[PDB]
Structure 1
């Protein structure tokens, strides 16, 4: 990208509801091009959410996104014998990307015999304020609090 960026892709919408955050999620769990498989996994987990909290699953998903979606994060740079971390504001695109990435990949290493359960109950956890996703988000904010001192480079 020494010449300039390319436009970001014309994303699809959710076929059923109309929130493309859903297709963002299914594309980020998509694994070996099995989109309809990941999609029925998705619908099943979302229906678990609906039948387990009486709400529309997309709203509680937004809830969990609001919990774990950061604003400030890290950016490293090797400088002067001790490579420094630097605080950076993080725009909405990368924010959402990173939040969903944490959420998926920490649903992966759970212990529920099945992904439909690991995923869904992890969503419940991040929603109502308990999950390992929230844990790692707090870890990152604490790291930014740590390396506040080095913002002044302004990079």
Structure 2
């Protein structure tokens, strides 16, 4: 990484619908690299989410991404023998990756008796503002405006 900016892979778009956000989502939800089962789980969860919400799946996913996408993040630094938290803005691509990846790693952890339904129901909870994603958004913002005053370092 020292030598310069590494080239970025040209990720392919989802052909079933037309949004590459699904491709990134299946890449994140990959468990030991079994894409066939992973993507069929993703599509089944999206179908049951459609059945639950009665609206457009792509519109719901875009709404969830808009609701849980960040703008500021907190980084750690040690100066003079003491560690401090400094906030720095993030690029929208990084923001989307964090939003979807927090969505999935929180959908991993409910007790709804089955995680194929947990995926869709966390999607719904992020959409309506009652999810683990949105509560982490509240916590991260609380930490952000708690430590905005350290922005003078600008690192």
TM class by smaller structure: over 0.9
C-alpha deviation, 1:123, in angstroms: 0.5
Instruction: Please give the secondary structure, in 1, of the residue aligned with 2:82.
Output: coil
CA distance in 1: counterparts of 2:147 and 2:141, whole angstroms: 10
C-alpha separation in 2, matches of 1:53 and 1:106:
20
In 1, the alpha carbon distance for the partners of 2:119 and 2:92 equals: 23
**More displaced, 16-25 or 75-84?**
75-84
Q: Deviations over 1:103-141 (max 9, x none)?
A: 001101101221111111011000011101100111111
Residues matched between the structures, number? 155
Residue aligning to 1:89: 89
Once the two structures are overlaid, the 10-residue window that deviates more, 78-87 or 18-27, is 78-87
**Aligned partners of 1:144, 1:38: CA distance in 2, in Å?**
34
Q: Bigger CA drift: 46-55 or 102-111?
A: 46-55
Q: Which runs of 4+ in 1 moved over 3 A?
A: none
* TM-score, normalised via structure 2 length: 0.97
Aligned partners of 2:7, 2:111: CA distance in 1, in Å? 40
Give 5+ residue unaligned stretches, structure 2. Answer: none
TM-superposition CA deviations, 1:15-51 (whole Å, max 9, x none): 2011101101000001111101110001101101111
TM-score normalised per structure 1: 0.97
RMSD: 0.9
Partner residue, 2:144: 144
1:6-155 aligned within 5 A = 6-155=6-155
